[PDB]
Structure formats: structure tokens, C-alpha cells
Design an enzyme around this catalytic site. Structure first.
Site, PDB file in Angstrom:
ATOM      1  N   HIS A  45       0.823  -1.218   0.000  1.00  0.00           N
ATOM      2  CA  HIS A  45       0.000   0.000   0.000  1.00  0.00           C
ATOM      3  C   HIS A  45       0.859   1.272   0.000  1.00  0.00           C
ATOM      4  O   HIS A  45       1.800   1.384   0.794  1.00  0.00           O
ATOM      5  CB  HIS A  45      -0.935  -0.005   1.215  1.00  0.00           C
ATOM      6  CG  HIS A  45      -1.948   1.101   1.215  1.00  0.00           C
ATOM      7  ND1 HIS A  45      -1.687   2.357   1.721  1.00  0.00           N
ATOM      8  CD2 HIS A  45      -3.224   1.137   0.764  1.00  0.00           C
ATOM      9  CE1 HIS A  45      -2.759   3.117   1.585  1.00  0.00           C
ATOM     10  NE2 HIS A  45      -3.706   2.401   1.006  1.00  0.00           N
ATOM     11  N   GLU A  96       4.664  10.304  -5.759  1.00  0.00           N
ATOM     12  CA  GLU A  96       5.493   9.641  -4.753  1.00  0.00           C
ATOM     13  C   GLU A  96       6.920  10.175  -4.751  1.00  0.00           C
ATOM     14  O   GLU A  96       7.580  10.184  -3.706  1.00  0.00           O
ATOM     15  CB  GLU A  96       5.496   8.131  -4.985  1.00  0.00           C
ATOM     16  CG  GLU A  96       4.190   7.428  -4.660  1.00  0.00           C
ATOM     17  CD  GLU A  96       4.229   5.953  -5.012  1.00  0.00           C
ATOM     18  OE1 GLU A  96       5.202   5.525  -5.667  1.00  0.00           O
ATOM     19  OE2 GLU A  96       3.288   5.223  -4.640  1.00  0.00           O
ATOM     20  N   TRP A 130     -28.256  14.933  10.518  1.00  0.00           N
ATOM     21  CA  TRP A 130     -27.467  14.224   9.515  1.00  0.00           C
ATOM     22  C   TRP A 130     -28.058  14.312   8.112  1.00  0.00           C
ATOM     23  O   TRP A 130     -27.410  14.862   7.216  1.00  0.00           O
ATOM     24  CB  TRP A 130     -27.305  12.758   9.938  1.00  0.00           C
ATOM     25  CG  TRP A 130     -26.519  11.937   8.967  1.00  0.00           C
ATOM     26  CD1 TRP A 130     -27.007  10.998   8.106  1.00  0.00           C
ATOM     27  CD2 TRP A 130     -25.102  11.984   8.751  1.00  0.00           C
ATOM     28  NE1 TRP A 130     -25.983  10.452   7.372  1.00  0.00           N
ATOM     29  CE2 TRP A 130     -24.804  11.040   7.746  1.00  0.00           C
ATOM     30  CE3 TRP A 130     -24.057  12.732   9.310  1.00  0.00           C
ATOM     31  CZ2 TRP A 130     -23.501  10.822   7.286  1.00  0.00           C
ATOM     32  CZ3 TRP A 130     -22.761  12.514   8.854  1.00  0.00           C
ATOM     33  CH2 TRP A 130     -22.497  11.567   7.850  1.00  0.00           C
ATOM     34  N   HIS A 156     -11.322   7.283   8.045  1.00  0.00           N
ATOM     35  CA  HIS A 156     -10.712   8.410   8.740  1.00  0.00           C
ATOM     36  C   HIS A 156     -11.400   8.759  10.055  1.00  0.00           C
ATOM     37  O   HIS A 156     -11.001   9.732  10.703  1.00  0.00           O
ATOM     38  CB  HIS A 156     -10.692   9.644   7.833  1.00  0.00           C
ATOM     39  CG  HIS A 156      -9.790   9.509   6.646  1.00  0.00           C
ATOM     40  ND1 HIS A 156     -10.174   8.869   5.488  1.00  0.00           N
ATOM     41  CD2 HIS A 156      -8.518   9.927   6.439  1.00  0.00           C
ATOM     42  CE1 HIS A 156      -9.180   8.901   4.618  1.00  0.00           C
ATOM     43  NE2 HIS A 156      -8.164   9.537   5.171  1.00  0.00           N
TER      44      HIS A 156
END
EC number: 3.4.17.23
Lengths: 49, 597
Positions: free
Chosen positions: B327, B357, B459, B487
Site C-alpha cells: 500500500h 510519490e 445528519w 478516517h
């Protein structure tokens, strides 16, 4: 109030900026004593006559 | 003699002592995703608490330093960083309750077990087949269950577990002399001790809402385009006056729009540009993708990196005999050693992330002379936002003619660029009110604004307000919708994704002006320009040692986030979405619901 000497950490896998490099320098000065260590710069062939 | 001379002697003790202990545990942690073994997993117990013991023994000495008499800027930031204690401000039994609940949040996400009671012979997970089934679900009831059962059985037992989580994290900020746990993420962003450039504690509510109105027509032409192209697929489902259901967005949440595109394409006759079939006939390997990317940095003015990168690091996965997590996370090991572990093939998006990267590593070289807690980005989100701006310039058709991945004769008309600007607006531009929506849910639940019955009432009312999404299934107070996100339970910062657009397209306007590009911003390239390379080089050597509101005026000359360079990137697409959307209905309706029959 802190201890002034700090440790080194040595590892081959660091890379170019964090590798250790052993440095020795030469110091030349003039004094009353005459000049001691002089130089070889190769020599030519000895001829006769 | 003063406090300023005493503060430099403690932190220079802290500098080289933290270079030894960070590199020692990350050498086994780089071998953690490389090799899954029984030997290195008990080294995660051996070297993992060496970081945990070191940070609280330096927070045992240093909390008695006052911040009032400190004259210099640098020391103050470094010291705030040292002082905030995190989870150690509690008692004994309250901290060990907080330590054992985070181990249960991470193991329930991947190993979470939900399947069908009508035919429970074979079940699925979140990483395997799941991906394949979702990818192709032109059906209706086949994709309706896969969103609902992922919400219902996962968030059933976590919703009483998050009742203890909301009351315990309110004790984090009040011992740190803040208000709530939602403002703990924006505590990194504060700049104090400067005249006029100062950052208040109510500004992030003010600055984001003033930029939200200018991007409100930006999402609205993208909102009518998704409704217009799905009319042939689903006749009876999506209403033209009403809103969109959430689970047709091509993702487990709708954070990524990159799958639904296999339907929303403007032109099927004109093909999409791909370098994948071009590189396989020229016999290329995974090494040559980073050999051609290495010559991109020497034409912009950036210097060459260290020579030990190629020989000790691996790229191609060495067989099936060992287990590796491939990953793509960028690795900073400290002390000049910068490595990478990726998952590589020959594809067009591996070349797209190759400048992403290498955008991390070329920033990681320049701040190596700085002390260790100031080794970061300019904010906390600059580290993952540095790579995509030069990855966008590598995806241009003008750069690929020079490095030769495309044909030397290529015709680009006005309908070729419609496919490029739509695909880049899927995961970047179109997720910006979706990033804004759950973050305003995140700050207002920690201030004591709503009670227990108003928890899910706020919501879906806000979801038909900001993004215009009405959920097709009505929900109880026994279900929690945000709990299935990566997250949330793993305690990561979701605030970096809103400024991912606003940093990079603002910085694209300053760099293409110094490189002297005439045209739209998607045709710009930073290569063969040494004028904008020295503008970039003053940014890369700072970090958060220089404050972030003083680092914006060195590049763009503006002290805030501006909407206008993103609308200049949207400007050829703004004409084409204006011509298409005239027959449809603008906006959306509040009162439309799918479950009302």
C-alpha cells in the site's frame, strides 16, 4: 544545566549526508629551524659522456 | 543567563537524541510492510513503546517552561509542539480505557463480518470481491443492500461505543486549555507572535464559509451533469426535480467519483488517452518509470539526490513466498535515509502517482538541516499535498511528446480536453462539499449543541442542504452512518482533503506565471523552466519552521485562499456545462424522498 558531550549514531544505511567522513588536515608553518620533510617528483634517466 | 539561552540547550539535547530513536524503530517498521513474520511483529511490541516512553519523559521535564518571555518565533512553535500532552492528561483508569478502545476500532474495520441471511453460504469483506461487485452494479436492489448492510451491522455495536467516545474526548481540550476535540485538529494551524499576519481562533469558520459561496455554482453545474447522464440508465429512480440517492456514486461512501465515470463520459467515439498499451510494446519495466521521472527534476532546477536510493530499496514484489503490504505510503525514516514501498504494474495511473510519490521524497531532502519537530510540511497537510501539483504537469499531453510515451502525431481538438477536465474533477473538485459536510458535523457535535435524539436528525437534513443527497432508506437512532469511514475510527485528519484543492491550484497560478505559459492551466508544464524552480526551492527548504501564513506571500503574494485560479481551470469546462444544462432543472428540491410511496 546540561552535559555538553553528545553521542554519535553509526549505521551504513544512512546515505551521503549522514555518513561519517574521517578528516585529517596538514598544518605548515615557518620557524627558526630549517625545512625538514621535502619532495619526491620522480627522476629522469642517468646519462654519461 | 536568560530563559532563551536555557531553551536552546534543552532542545539541542532533544534533536540528536530523537534522530537515533526515530530511525531505530522505523527500520523494523519499514520491514513490517515488507515482511509479515512472527519475528518482526513482536519487534512492534519491542520498539513501538520506545517512541511512547520517550515522548512522555521529555514531557515530564518541559511543561514548566513558560511561553510568555520567549522572544524568538522558532522556539515557541517547537515548544508548543513539545508541550501538548495528548492522551496523558487523564487519570490512570480513564487513560487505559482510551488505550483499549482504539484497538477495537481498527480491528472491526477490516475483519468486520456482514453477509446475507437469505443465502449465507459464502460471505464477503471490505477489501476482496466487494470491490468487484460494486464496480459493476447497474442493478438497483443488488447495490441497495450493499450500502445498507455496511452501515447497519457495523455501526450497531459502535454507536453505544461512541457514546463513551464523545464524553471522553471533551476532557482532552479542557486540560489543554482549549474548548473541544474538533478544534484539536486546527490547533496546529495557529500562528502567534507576528504583527498583522496573526491567525485567530474563529477564522476557519469564517474563511471556509466565504469560499463556500463562490464554489456553490461550481458544484451546481457538476450536480446537474450527473443527473442528466444517468437518465438513460435509470428511468424510474432518479427524479429530475428531486435529489440523488447516495449509493449510486460508485463508492462505499461517495468520496471517490472515479467508478461512476464508466457511464457519465461525454463522448464514447473519441477514446480516452492511455499510455498503458503504448509502454508494453516498447519493452519497459518498473525501474524505467522512475528513470524517466528522475530526469524531470533535473530540468526544473532541483538537484540530484543521494546515491544509496536504488541499491537498498525494492520495487517489484519478490514472489508469492512472503507476504507484503504494498500500500503506497511515503516513508520518512530520518537521518538521510528515504525509502519507498509501492505496488507496481504497467498501468497509466502508476505513472500518474510516480510524480506524486517522488514529490514527497524531493521535498523530504531539503528540510533535513532543520530540527526534528520542525521537520514537517508548512502545515500538517502539506506532506501529502506536495506531489499532485507536479503529477498534474506530468499528465499533460505536451510533456508526453518530449519523453515519448505518446505518438509524435497526435490531434487534440476541443472535445479531447472535455474528457481530461472531467476525470480530474472527480476525485479533486467534486469532493469539496462532501469534505465540507462531515467536518461541519464534526465540529458541532463536540460543542454540546445537539442532544441524543438530534444526533441523526441533523445528519440527513444537512445532506440535502450542502451536497443535495436524500438517503433512500430511513434510519433509526440505533444506526450510525459516519462510523464506516476509514478516517473516523482510525483517528486520522480529514481536514487535509479540503485544502488539497486550495493549496495546489493556487500554487499552480504562481508557478506557471514564472515559467511563462500562455493558455489554460491544464496545458501548463513546469519542465524546462529554471525561473519557477528557484521560487519552488525557497518553499521546499522551510517546513513549519517558517509559519504557513508567511510562506504564502513568498509564492503567490496573497495571504488567503482564493477561488479564482480554480475557476480559471474550470473556464473551458464552464462554457460546455452551460450549453448542456439548459434543458434540465437547476438546483434541487427539499421535500422529495425516495421512501415515500
Amino acid at each position: 544545566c546540561y552535559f555538553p558531550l553528545r553521542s554519535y549514531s553509526f549505521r551504513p544505511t544512512y546515505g551521503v549526508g549522514h555518513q561519517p567522513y574521517r578528516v585529517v588536515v596538514l598544518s605548515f608553518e615557518l620557524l627558526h629551524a630549517p625545512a625538514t620533510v621535502c619532495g619526491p617528483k620522480k627522476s629522469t634517466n642517468l646519462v654519461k659522456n | 543567563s536568560t530563559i532563551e539561552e536555557q531553551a536552546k540547550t534543552f532542545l539541542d539535547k532533544f534533536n540528536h537524541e530523537a534522530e537515533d530513536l526515530f530511525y531505530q524503530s522505523s527500520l523494523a517498521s519499514w520491514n513490517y510492510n515488507t515482511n509479515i513474520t512472527e519475528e518482526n511483529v513482536q519487534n512492534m511490541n519491542n520498539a513501538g513503546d520506545k517512541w511512547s516512553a520517550f515522548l512522555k519523559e521529555q514531557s515530564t521535564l518541559a511543561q514548566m517552561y513558560p511561553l510568555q518571555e520567549i522572544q524568538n518565533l522558532t522556539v515557541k512553535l517547537q515548544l508548543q509542539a513539545l508541550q501538548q500532552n495528548g492522551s496523558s492528561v487523564l487519570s490512570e483508569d480513564k487513560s487505559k480505557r482510551l488505550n483499549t478502545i482504539l484497538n477495537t476500532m481498527s480491528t472491526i474495520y477490516s475483519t468486520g463480518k456482514v453477509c446475507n441471511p437469505d443465502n449465507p453460504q459464502e460471505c464477503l469483506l471490505l477489501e476482496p470481491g466487494l470491490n468487484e461487485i460494486m464496480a459493476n452494479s447497474l442493478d438497483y436492489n443488488e447495490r441497495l443492500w450493499a450500502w445498507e448492510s455496511w452501515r447497519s451491522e457495523v455501526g450497531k455495536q459502535l454507536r453505544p461505543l461512541y457514546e463513551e467516545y464523545v464524553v471522553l474526548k471533551n476532557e482532552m481540550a479542557r486540560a489543554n486549555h482549549y474548548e473541544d476535540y474538533g478544534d484539536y485538529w486546527r490547533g496546529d494551524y495557529e500562528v502567534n507572535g507576528v504583527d498583522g499576519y496573526d491567525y485567530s481562533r474563529g477564522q476557519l469558520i469564517e474563511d471556509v464559509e466565504h469560499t463556500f459561496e463562490e464554489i456553490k455554482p461550481l458544484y451546481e453545474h457538476l450536480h446537474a451533469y450527473v443527473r442528466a447522464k444517468l437518465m438513460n440508465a435509470y428511468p424510474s429512480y432518479i427524479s429530475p426535480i428531486g435529489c440523488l440517492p447516495a449509493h449510486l456514486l460508485g463508492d462505499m461512501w461517495g468520496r471517490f467519483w472515479t467508478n461512476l465515470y464508466s457511464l457519465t463520459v461525454p463522448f464514447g467515439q473519441k477514446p480516452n488517452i492511455d499510455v498503458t498499451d503504448a509502454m508494453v510494446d516498447q519493452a519497459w519495466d518498473a525501474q524505467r518509470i522512475f528513470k524517466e521521472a528522475e530526469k524531470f527534476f533535473v530540468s526544473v532546477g532541483l538537484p540530484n539526490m543521494t546515491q544509496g536510493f536504488w541499491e537498498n530499496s525494492m520495487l517489484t514484489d519478490p514472489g508469492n513466498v512472503q507476504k507484503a503490504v504494498c500500500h503506497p505510503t511515503a516513508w520518512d525514516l530520518g537521518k538521510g535515509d528515504f525509502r519507498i514501498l509501492m505496488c507496481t504494474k504497467v498501468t497509466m495511473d502508476d505513472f500518474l502517482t510516480a510524480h506524486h510519490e517522488m514529490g514527497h521524497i524531493q521535498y523530504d531532502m531539503a528540510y533535513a538541516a532543520q530540527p526534528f519537530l520542525l521537520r514537517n510540511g508548512a502545515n500538517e497537510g502539506f506532506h501529502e499535498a506536495v506531489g499532485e501539483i507536479m503529477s498534474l504537469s506530468a499528465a499533460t499531453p505536451k510533456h508526453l511528446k518530449s519523453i515519448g510515451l505518446l505518438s509524435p502525431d497526435f490531434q487534440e481538438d476541443n472535445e479531447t480536453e472535455i474528457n481530461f477536465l472531467l476525470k480530474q474533477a472527480l476525485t479533486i473538485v467534486g469532493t469539496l462539499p462532501f469534505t465540507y459536510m462531515l467536518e461541519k458535523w464534526r465540529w458541532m457535535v463536540f460543542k454540546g449543541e445537539i442532544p441524543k435524539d438530534q444526533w441523526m436528525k441533523k445528519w440527513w437534513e444537512m445532506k440535502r442542504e450542502i451536497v443535495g443527497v436524500v438517503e433512500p432508506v430511513p434510519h433509526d437512532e440505533t444506526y450510525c452512518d459516519p462510523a464506516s469511514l476509514f478516517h473516523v475510527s482510525n483517528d486520522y485528519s480529514f481536514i487535509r482533503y479540503y485544502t488539497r484543492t486550495l493549496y495546489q491550484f493556487q500554487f499552480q497560478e504562481a508557478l506557471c506565471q514564472a515559467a511563462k505559459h500562455e493558455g489554460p492551466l491544464h496545458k501548463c508544464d513546469i519542465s524546462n523552466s529554471t525561473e519557477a524552480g528557484q521560487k519552488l526551492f525557497n518553499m521546499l527548504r522551510l517546513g513549519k519552521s517558517e509559519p504557513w501564513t508567511l510562506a504564502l506571500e513568498n509564492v503567490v503574494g496573497a495571504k488567503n485562499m482564493n477561488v479564482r485560479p480554480l475557476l480559471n481551470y474550470f473556464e473551458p469546462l464552464f462554457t460546455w456545462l452551460k450549453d448542456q444544462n439548459k434543458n434540465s432543472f437547476v438546483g434541487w428540491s427539499t421535500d422529495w424522498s425516495p421512501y415515500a410511496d
